[PDB]
Amino acid sequence: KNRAARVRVSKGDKPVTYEEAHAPHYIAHRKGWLSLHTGNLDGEDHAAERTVEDVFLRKFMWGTFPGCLADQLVLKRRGNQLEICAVVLRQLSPHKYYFLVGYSETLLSYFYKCPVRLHLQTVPSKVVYKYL
Amino acid sequence: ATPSLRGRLARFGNPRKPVLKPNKPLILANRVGERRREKGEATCITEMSVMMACWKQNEFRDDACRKEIQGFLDCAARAQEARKMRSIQETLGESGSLLPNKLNKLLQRFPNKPYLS
Amino acid sequence: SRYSPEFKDPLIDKEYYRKPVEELTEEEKYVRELKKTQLIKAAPAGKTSSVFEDPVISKFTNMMMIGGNKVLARSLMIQTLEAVKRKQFEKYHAASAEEQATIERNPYTIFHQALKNCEPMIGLVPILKGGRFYQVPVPLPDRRRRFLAMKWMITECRDKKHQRTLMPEKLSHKLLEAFHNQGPVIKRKHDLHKMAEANRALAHYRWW
Amino acid sequence: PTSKRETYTEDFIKKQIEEFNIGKRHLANMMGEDPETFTQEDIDRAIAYLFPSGLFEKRARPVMKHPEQIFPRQRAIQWGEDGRPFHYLFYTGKQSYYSLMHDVYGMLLNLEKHQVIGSRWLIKEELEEMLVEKLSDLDYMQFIRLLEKLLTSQCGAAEEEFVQRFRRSVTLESKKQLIEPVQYDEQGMAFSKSEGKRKTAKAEAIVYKHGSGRIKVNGIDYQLYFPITQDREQLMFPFHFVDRLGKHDVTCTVSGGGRSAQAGAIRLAMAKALCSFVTEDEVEWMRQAGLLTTDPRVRERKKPGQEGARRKFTWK
RNA sequence: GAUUAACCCAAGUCAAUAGAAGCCGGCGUAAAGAGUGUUUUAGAUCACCCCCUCCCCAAUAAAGCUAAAACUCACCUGAGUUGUAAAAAACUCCAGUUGACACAAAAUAGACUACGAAAGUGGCUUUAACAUAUCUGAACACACAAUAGCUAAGACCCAAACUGGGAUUAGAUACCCCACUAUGCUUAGCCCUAAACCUCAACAGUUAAAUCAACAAAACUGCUCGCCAGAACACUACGAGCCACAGCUUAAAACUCAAA
RNA sequence: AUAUACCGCCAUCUUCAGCAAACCCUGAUGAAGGCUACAAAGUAAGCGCAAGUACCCACGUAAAGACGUUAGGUCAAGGUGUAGCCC
Ligand SMILES: CN[C@@H]1[C@H](O[C@H]2[C@H](O[C@H]3[C@H](O)[C@@H](O)[C@H](NC(=N)N)[C@@H](O)[C@@H]3NC(=N)N)O[C@@H](C)[C@]2(O)C=O)O[C@@H](CO)[C@H](O)[C@H]1O
Ligand SMILES: [K+]
Ligand SMILES: [K+]
Ligand SMILES: [K+]
Ligand SMILES: [K+]
Ligand SMILES: [Mg+2]
Ligand SMILES: [Mg+2]
Ligand SMILES: [Mg+2]
Ligand SMILES: [Mg+2]
Ligand SMILES: [Mg+2]
Ligand SMILES: [Mg+2]
Ligand SMILES: [Mg+2]
Ligand SMILES: [Mg+2]
């Protein structure tokens, strides 16, 4: 049976998110896309280089904001700019958040030669869609 | 008059030898058996025997045995209609005895109680 | 099917609609109003409202076609009809004055009657009784015998005994032999009739 | 336990009513409209511009509706502080369903003492909204059996109103072909234009009111354009059925498809354009003959694991 | 197994062995009501009071009888009859009608439920005839006991182990077909067995209470006799007894398992 | 090396309709079991089916398809537990 991106049923004590509660056949019906660029449009190029940046950015943020990411990243590209939008927990102190914003923005701007901006949206606790 | 059951089954008070040895307890059930399928009666056989007897005499020519064939043909048409009419009508039509499915809804409203409550 | 169950088959009969309201029976009149509400399927390409439409000559054309080549199947049928037509005109000018009254020249009347002379009355069906298959005589239905007549005529012509003869000349020759109750297709019906009358002792194995 | 059914009280819904009204005045300031005359259709239009979502499911897109159309209707508290249920049939479990059967059975007894198209019985799913009670299929049938029994009897005027509540309405679209508007050309000849479709073929047909039975497909005589007789037979069919051959002049232009797909597309176009020059009764006969219906049969796609659309690879 | 730590006892520890604790429980299916009845020595309290299904329906033994079917013979006719999921073999003084004709076996009734100790008994008639005024009471006493079987002399319609033939089958010492014998029957002796099982002892009594593991045919009480104590070895071996000599009855142990 | 330690991605029954938490009752509180609509102990969130959606509609085709089964397949996609090699 199909397994991809599916959270198997449990007693009911497992909390899943909206994105985690929907399988691949809902990606364009009930879900959007976590990355939005033009590489995959008809007649566009550099789809393999925008993809490698996304795989690394999601890992850079997961290891740079450990335990603070409630949900997956939403990467946005507008021309030269790259916008990282994230939902984070409120456990960490704000002082440490501002440090990580200026460190990640600057480091990633010199690495991908592009203006990078990061927009945090803190949430008290991980939003729960339903309990599987 | 339903046959008697006094001194028939092997018991403690009955001194004599048993008369009946039932393998299933003699207690009415709350349902009846489903009606079996009938083998059926073959139709248009006499018309089918006088039509194949004419072929042998006339060496299987369909110009001299025309009358016989119609008997076998007209019969088949009538027999076919009866089969269609009989199957549908019997279940939908209520004649004589009831059907098990409707008769078991009546026996389950008045179940047999071989226990105390 | 891309049609829903609501869709009903269309009626191409052109003289049915023309029927005056005065002739319409109460049951028929009701039907006509009901059809208005119903959805109707689109008429298929095969059948039109022409006066020359023959359902038996269209079904015989579909039973010869190979791979959807209906232009060739129809071409063979019309050539056969024209070959039967030209062969009877040649048998009519060379006949005596009193022999011309019994010579049919309409190829259709020959096609329908020839197929009626090949329709068998009873067939052999294998029934399993006692772990063995017995070819017991069974009454063929009206459709089955109409289908077998067409299948046998096309099998005999397709049979590779005639080395280099075109189908129109073969089908035309077999249709004229069956019209006079002659030929293998008629003989094939007798052989099925001789085996159903010899094995009539096993006419009780069947139930239906 | 972590999973609890989201229960919404009257005080919570009352605070949601105030946030929508205030949000309704903010959305009108963004778009520059008048707050007072700002309906719900404009909110749906403004939320689709400000929050453009291409999700196929319309229930998964942003929505800013009134809290009474979002939150579901909930069974209200069924007892006071003392604990006595208001209704006398509370302990049945279906006090709303049984109060209706008790009322209907009470009106059928009075009748004994003193003594249609376009409408359908309320469906099961619509009857659980009037009562806010889950109902089985069998219970719904029992209720319908009493209403029908009510109708057969000589019901009074009041009873008719009662039954009417449970009778929903169905809009039936008259199966009548839409006549095309007869136009006039520069010379003054009357005609009607229509379009047809068959498989991948699309056709436009112009049918002149008076003609000598001349048809030009793409500027070519039909017999030249259609060599195969079958194709010509399809062209004749519409006119032969309405017994008016050799009376109109047709000028069509078919594009796409193949030999047999183009004729079918023209047949349907001529037939639709020939309905403007025939009586209503004749147009219904054409419809019943399958001359005004678009054949929906189109090629079926092939599946990744099979040889064809439905054919399967040989089973080893 | 070594090592470390720990537990128990402790100048002891604890491996082998032996012993100490064994009857008031059961017997429809778990091991047990041993085929039936009688009595003895004796035991019981259901024996006096005190009471209610005599006789008759298929008990038994003897003698006699015969309706239906069959065999055989004879006449007449026919050329085949048998066999079956389908064949072969077999038979052809064969088959069908009619008539004559049993030491065999006893439709319907019987939807009855009787007799008798049980076994068992279901065609007709006749004779003789069916223990006991308390209960219980035996592997062995006394007397019975289906079928099968032995010995001897008769009978013989049919059926039929064995055997022979035909077929099936990988094979077929079987199932299917045919034929025939011992045998089944009578008389006279023997044998003494059964899933002889209504697997539910005899007598008396109760229907209340905790109804009662389960299933089966509700659960109990009194009294007595008989039997039984893990499985298998074992319806065995030995011994004894017996008209039984490949027999029956009675009936162990060793080895073995930790289950049945 | 081990798919008989696994994740991951699948096959299959599935061209299925089950699945199930939490309660309740029955059976003397045994394993177990749980329906009758003129209704007799079942109620049920959740998963699935269904519905929605995609494609040319209401049709059809895709997709979807639970829990389980076969220690099914793959350590050779990659990753990885354990054991092993390290001139
Ligand atoms: C609870 N134990 C059950 C029992 O196991 C037993 C079983 O015991 C067996 C004996 O060794 C053997 O000599 C004995 N063999 C004989 N010829 N007597 C077996 O019959 C015996 N099995 C048995 N009674 N079920 O095998 C042994 C090794 C065992 O594991 C000992 O405890 O029997 C086994 C089945 O035989 C089951 O599988 C086990 O669950
Ligand atoms: K018994
Ligand atoms: K796996
Ligand atoms: K590995
Ligand atoms: K791997
Ligand atoms: Mg039994
Ligand atoms: Mg193909
Ligand atoms: Mg026992
Ligand atoms: Mg006994
Ligand atoms: Mg014994
Ligand atoms: Mg008799
Ligand atoms: Mg005594
Ligand atoms: Mg003794």
Ligand SMILES: [Mg+2]
């Ligand atoms: Mg004995």
Ligand SMILES: [Mg+2]
């Ligand atoms: Mg004896």
Ligand SMILES: [Mg+2]
């Ligand atoms: Mg003897």
Ligand SMILES: [Mg+2]
């Ligand atoms: Mg004999």
Ligand SMILES: [Mg+2]
């Ligand atoms: Mg032999």
Ligand SMILES: [Mg+2]
């Ligand atoms: Mg003899």
Ligand SMILES: [Mg+2]
């Ligand atoms: Mg006996």
Ligand SMILES: [Mg+2]
């Ligand atoms: Mg005794």
Ligand SMILES: [Mg+2]
């Ligand atoms: Mg023992």
Ligand SMILES: [Mg+2]
């Ligand atoms: Mg013995």
Ligand SMILES: [Mg+2]
């Ligand atoms: Mg012995």
Ligand SMILES: [Mg+2]
């Ligand atoms: Mg001895």
Ligand SMILES: [Mg+2]
């Ligand atoms: Mg595996």
Ligand SMILES: [Mg+2]
């Ligand atoms: Mg659909």
Ligand SMILES: [Mg+2]
């Ligand atoms: Mg699929």
Ligand SMILES: [Mg+2]
């Ligand atoms: Mg679906």
